[model samples]
Target: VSVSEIRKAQRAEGPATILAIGTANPANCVEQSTYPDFYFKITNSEHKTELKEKFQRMCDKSMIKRRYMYLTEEILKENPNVCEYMAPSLDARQDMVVVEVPRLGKEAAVKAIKEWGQPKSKITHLIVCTTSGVDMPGADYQLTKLLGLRPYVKRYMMYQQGCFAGGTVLRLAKDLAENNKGARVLVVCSEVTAVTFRGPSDTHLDSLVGQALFGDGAAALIVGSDPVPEIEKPIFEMVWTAQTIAPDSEGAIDGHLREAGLTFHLLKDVPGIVSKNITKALVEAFEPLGISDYNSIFWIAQPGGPAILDQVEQKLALKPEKMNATREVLSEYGNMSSACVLFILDEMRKKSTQNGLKTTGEGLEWGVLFGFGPGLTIETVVLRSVAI
Candidate 1:
């Protein structure tokens, strides 16, 4: 069921609000060029030279021009206790380090939320999204206690979902705000998939692509309905949302907490699958918005990777300019999984303010946000312009 169809009280003519957004990145930063330099050190003597060549090829294919790698020294500063029992070995290949995924998520969340400024007691809900691992009490509750959220705040934890969990969290938050009379919701997504990086196990192609393209980061957003006083009108109106699950595609990508560490097995048919299904998925998502063609909609696409975006754009007949934000973010920050969408939203918001762009309008300002993950899940949200 659609959010609007599920929540009657949300029909009330109240303004949607986005109070603030906070983002944080890993400390042991690596530029695209330095990525291979680090990987070469981690490779064993037998495979060293060949692996270096493979790493070079992968980085070239990696849509991300750069990414940030977190180190033990930086992590221990904020969370000294996290590694008290199992210290990560700096001597170990950075790619082979298998630290606790939950610890990474928790630290990233804490760092991001700490930047969201003071929290009012009125905030009634919290949503946490992560694809990296499974842990008890989860990042949501851990955040509540660490960040000092109100005692009354309700919590929901979403896990094992892929990169699209970022969009899923936002969609879910919109619903929560719509259903509850007066609810303020916070959404956070943290991905430290870097810890699972394995040099020997990775094929040269995957290793190179992963080293240059994947990095660690976290992001948080505060959203609420009209009941909150002084809350600005929403930056953009959420028109409609659609989710499509391709059958028998569960193997496309599967993430689970493993004894060795969090393991992600990517079937890697993503480019072809996205190429095959994007036309139909776009149609299902956009038709409800009264759109017959993709050429007209402004795009805020997830930076899944440069290859996937390019393939889908070609299939959909969308212009390269439409993917400007996606390309830029991927190149700049790597892919922060669920945090990627918020990065695009953050950039769009900045551009809108600078240009005095009207967010709400007739056909003048319509856009779509896209995310893909496991379950072969595809989520598309139609957004309308909102006048500030």
Candidate 2:
């Protein structure tokens, strides 16, 4: 009852839980049907008639309708060189990332704290993640300052973590909340596409896929242990988490920085690789809980694109309704990189309660969240529902 008790007391009594989620979108809402013409018009690539035509087809296949982005035609007109390929555009891009990332992150975090029903003093940690470029005194600190958080609130920032970052970041939050008895983590994943925007190049047609698919978004959630009764209402219980990379699948979703900006090469091999490796990862994640029968749980997955969603659905044998949250987020927001998963999670919980589902997990006790991206990394978080 001495050292053992102290060691046991060091950890929190309850599992870490997602207490609140908040999401924010960019101002420029671009419709996909007209995006090809708009993209060609904005970038002065109207002369590439054939390439623009091909991009329209890609847009149609994207399974997305409208996307909100920070950059507009007017902004592009202000920095026309930003739309050019292989141009020295880093300074112009970095300036925007530095300003916009924290502003949007604060927007979402404010909303999350509003739902959290707590004082800013309660936020013991700030976790800032962005797929955008890195910055000194990064969004982690900037967001704290912007939010008027405490001077000593512990800070963490991640840059260029790819689309899987929401899950990757949540995995980190889980450990942080569990290890520290009274810890409250504010996790925000924010993205803006200006750094990587470029005009079409016939030689790098793969980049067009990103142009057609990505949208800007910021999502924030509060993760903590042992919710305060009548004040902190736990949403999804963080039961377990896992991450894995597909073997021999290097460069499937490659992003490299250059004089111009971030250039991404997405191979057709991504969906296949994800399908092959997913079962192994999920099996390991759920093994501790004796979880089987994929249909038993709801699925909250980041919408990467049409093929990856379809491929994962088939491989997992997930039910039709299991995909609604993912599809809806994709249809409305496109792929907002690392920010999309929490957006999906936020949508899932709200819809679940709105429909009077018995639990936050669609009347089921179990659910899983999936995030996939570069490094060909796959993140799986096993979750249990908290009752309404």
Candidate 3:
């Protein structure tokens, strides 16, 4: 049986609900226009005319206006030839990751905790997810210390799971909260893309896509079984989650560690691959939940890229407004790797607050969150808004 079916068979009522979300980014914001020319200059390519024009076109099509980074544009300009001569060693990148990930992770976690108005000691589980860089003891250890979470808090560190990790963590949080009554799971997704930098020498499409697409950011969410107080802001309950691996598409996107740093191999055909498989996967995952009427459900799609979103929109037959949150986040912050969905979730919450709560005339409104990653995997969760 499918994951959805298995989950259905074992499903428990009154599952975990997401109380609040918070996001953080480094202070260095780079304009998209500034980076294309800067990247062209730093790329160690002999074919200056051809590569420069190609890189410019890629930037033009990126649809992103700005993105945050640990390496500021000012820093890049000061040493334009830095990557041209030598890339940062893996050790140096890892060291930066150790410092930055926790700092940003803690900032996000604190905001989430504050928003929930819950004491740090009440959090029983901490899940830290990332794919941008690796460090000993990981972000979980540092986050617990930095956020003043109990030393004995149960912890899980998710590494190298790619962009879908935010959804993965939510699924795990649901399981934990359901099985352990009164459990509060703190989920933090952080990525330091600046540390995953590939030099211009590796001008393959994958590297170009990575540089153009990714940005540094972190997000945190508080999930628990306790119902949100009536006076508190509305919360979204986890209804169901399903994971699907596209058939024969494992090679579409891959990330591996190398002497230089973490290297990515994103095949150019990913959009087509996703288009071919996503509709079928969505049907299998959501049909069981009686989610045939797409209009009733808000979509929180991963803005992997303009192309990926376009494919999803076409395949799913969604209106542009349905994807406005995803588009807005991508244009403003680019993709924050595993943390992207939480940023989208925050945006969704803001929009919901502005518009006031929504209902389908059949009770609470519904939403679906979808994220894709390296395994050519698709992860989805059904959301039910508990807004009276």
Candidate 4:
């Protein structure tokens, strides 16, 4: 066969689309109004009256009403070392991740498969992304078995991936689905902050920021090219995806595995840095499509926090309404890290239906999803709605 013939044979006929989506949360939730009391009590920090007041102020500014967690007070009590910021508690957290990570992923996967209306055996590939755990028998292996996926189902896993992992996994899933005809790739992003949850420390301000920001949850999706026509309804077409790394930004998201478990300190000027460079990053992502009218596009941005969202709104000149989906998730669920964006994606579709829009993309055919994480990395995906 000729090179062109071989190429045609190997590639799928249509663009990869999000065929289904599922999001799951832990059983335990803490209201922000009570989170200050909860935190002080859990961490034995009730004596730090001044610090508790400052923590209370930060909680109010979070734009969050409630946040879920896998790490309940009972769990924290048993693993007492995990309650201290500088306590060496790596093994305790890792032990929990090995079992809990896949369990949450399995719960989300069930919902996605139901939405997908397909048998588990039909899933040709699996992509599992998490910062929740690392082991030879990883979440992917455990999830594959738990979901009843076939023995030979191709599997890939990403460990210690930070917030940007939502984009990274989709980017990779798109590649897998587009290259293999009839392939149905299942993507599961699960996060359990137990691995990084720690008590407040005067010395580690960013730890406190992380505590006030991150949450625990999982989101799953099915991606495939050339839907089954009668059975599958494509949510959004994966038109284009790109990753841009800002220069000289290695330390901005310094996530590391340590004796005390995973820890990352977010730099002070992160919002400023991303705002300064987003114009260029987005331009590069959209220039190929010859798109310039930024306001006409729907936005699926990670609500890293209010500051980052506020800065980009100013920088990109996005209408305040454009961020409704992002902020809604932030307020309802807090930041589930890599799992958060998919929650926003699901939220967008639901909100559009509620508002009687013609499309899931907030009445727009074109949109963009941004994922921000360490390396000062920015992952941008160009999405086109398959309007009803």
Candidate 5:
């Protein structure tokens, strides 16, 4: 079927709407100002003065004020020499993930379910997305038991898809809800960057950037075909989604397991590649919806970092306020990987409610969502916020 046909069918049936969102972070929070000191204490370097000065500069310019971690300060202090000589083995990181991911994921998921005011049995499908952890039973199974979801509830896991996996899961939930009448899909995304930490010994610039920018967080949302009557206005409805991979840019961003930990590789040319390709991808994604110009749409872009955001704004000629939510999330939590977009969405919803914004008589408010991840891939979703 054509794009138009698919959208027509979606409208004919009830459009899948995002009803509520909830976000959570670990208790161990570190202010960015203190990061340099923390790293100096934990890492051993031959050129101590140079390393400390470089890290201090990175932290000051990161545009991030604070971030949470799965590892407590006391826990890190106990093993100050671990990163200096030998990083933890993959098995040790996996053990940390097994314990921390579920606890944080469940906390976020339960809040979303409760805020939606629906019985646990009503969730027919559960989708969990993650990149930092590997487990046999996985976080999904643990969430099912913790949330008291039905034994027969369908379960799906999206792992190792990188930062874009959160949007990917939401797209899947939208499809499931639209295809099955009265279906409600619960989507949860969690990450434990503490498990992916690389010490100063691996002092590649990419590793340094990743270490400074990444943090731990989880977010959950309830999306369904039927709008909640109690919610006088729906948060937003999924209209259409599109994805694209840049030519010969596959290595721009990547992550894989190493004996030490899950290692990330980010090329310095990433911002340029994204700037060159993102507009065209976004234009194609919006064309079917009759959106021809970028200026008319609200943008909810993923803040890979301050540099990425600057490139995006420059390429699109977007105003600073247009990406306020993205920047705010970056400032508060750094990049929480796949969980970042949901945090931005939650902020956008709150902004709309606080400003008393509503859809016009056409019953829709228009916006665009964008996420970039490994594979040098770009994903765009056109959103139409429907008033109940």
Candidate 6:
């Protein structure tokens, strides 16, 4: 639908919400070390010792050794060289971004919602996105009391949705705000990917791949009738969204709860698979808007690691700078799973202010945000800045 159509619908509707995002990250937790430690713990160090040796031998090959999570500091004290070359590339200090969720899922949701910035009284709905950890009552219930939101506020949660959950949650919030008129919706995503580190005995390539990616972090956003003030235009203007799943590529990316913890399985062929299918998804997503080229678009991909970005660039024929945001975030904070997109969005928002892009409207800046996750699912949204 056109922007005017959406606005009319919103006028006839309840709310016109936009996102005010708060992104958080964990300490110096790199995927390579954490994954191997988890694997060794669960498997009792069998033949995987060889694999671990091999991993260490090529630590520089993965481009993930420098990626930091919540656990990085403690790990650093133990192995001084762990992040020697990668230290300069890291983001905020690792200890600052930790999250603690209750085994009772609902309570965790409420805590996260409150943390995201909403007075319980103002919230009309609560939506939680998570792919790590296990809990009963599924998070929605626990959030009710923790946030003290109105008893009647609607509740929903998306679990095991993988990294794409961030974009998916945004789409859901946009639709809800369009329908609810004056209502408010909150979206929160938290993932402790460190739990998925591979075991010492698991000598599989997928396990190694998972270790090369996945880190811990959480992002909370409030999408409501109001937008972040003091800007010429809002950061995101929802025009349309689309989702596509590659049926044959399910095995390429999958997340499972194993005996040890949550395990994210990454098949080595993802670059090849995504390179082949992403064009179709992007074309279809943008086709309805009659747009053939994008001047500047933010890609909040789930870090997947260094080579994946290069491959995507080649496949999409993207300009050298098309995915600068993605690369920067990856180098700075690794992959915070479901929270990565918001972190990138937060950075873009800050960068827009620093670079004067929002005020300048340089080259008709548009946002084509996308994320890929298990199910080989791709979620995308097409947005043009809404002039204030």
Candidate 6: C-alpha RMSD after superposition:
7.9
Off by over 4 Å in 2: 1-10
Model 5 lDDT per residue over 1-388, tens place? 5987766655426788888788999988889998878766666553577767777788888899999988765665655533633465677677778778878999999888888877879898899888887787878898888888998888998777788776788778888888866678889999988566756644576777777898899999988886757652357788888778888796899887766777788864877888888878877877777777676676777777888888988988977777887898999999998999999988877776666666421223678887888988887877876552
The count of backbone overlaps in candidate 6 is 25
Q: TM-score of every model?
A: 0.81, 0.97, 0.90, 0.97, 0.91, 0.76
In model 2, how large is the Cα lDDT of residue 377?
89
Task: Order candidates by TM-score, high to low.
Answer: 4, 2, 5, 3, 1, 6
Each candidate: RMSD: 5.8, 1.7, 4.8, 1.3, 4.1, 7.9
lDDT of 1 at 57: 72
| lDDT on C-alpha atoms for all candidate structures | 0.64, 0.88, 0.78, 0.89, 0.79, 0.59
Q: Count the backbone clashes (under 3 Å) in each candidate.
A: 4, 0, 0, 0, 0, 25
- Across 256-318, the per-residue lDDT of candidate 3 in tens digits comes to 776667777876477787778877866776688777767667878777788988987887788
Which residue runs of candidate 6 sit more than 4 Å off their true CA positions?
A: 1-17, 27-50, 57-59, 65-99, 102-120, 225-233, 295-298, 359-364, 386-388
- Candidate 5 off by > 4 Å: 1-12, 78-88, 231-233, 359-364
Candidate 4's C-alpha runs over 4 A off are 1-6
**Backbone clash total, candidate 2:** 0
Residue 99, candidate 3: C-alpha displacement in angstroms? 0.6
lDDT tens digits, residue span 212-248, model 1: 5667777777766664344343555565677887665
The digit string of per-residue lDDT tens for model 6 on 1-388 reads: 5998777656424234344566555444445545555434443444456676665644445555445454443543443222221222112221122224322223334444544454558778777777764456656555566656688878777777787777798888787767666566767777765355434324455655555566666666666655435531244566677888876786778765544445456664777777677778777866676666644454555566666677888877788676776777776666667777777776666666677664212224556777777778778866554442
Q: Candidate 3, 314: how far from true, in Å? A: 1.3
Error of 4 at 388 (Å): 2.5
- Candidate 2 on 1-388: residue-level lDDT in tens? 6988887778777889999999998788999989998898888889998898889999999999999988988888888778886688888888888899888888899999999989989899889999887878888988887898898998888888999999988899998899888899999999998888888987788898889999999999999999888888999988888888889788889888776788889775787888888889878887777887888888888777878888888988777788898999999999999999999888888899999989888888988998999888899998999886
lDDT of 2 at 340: 94
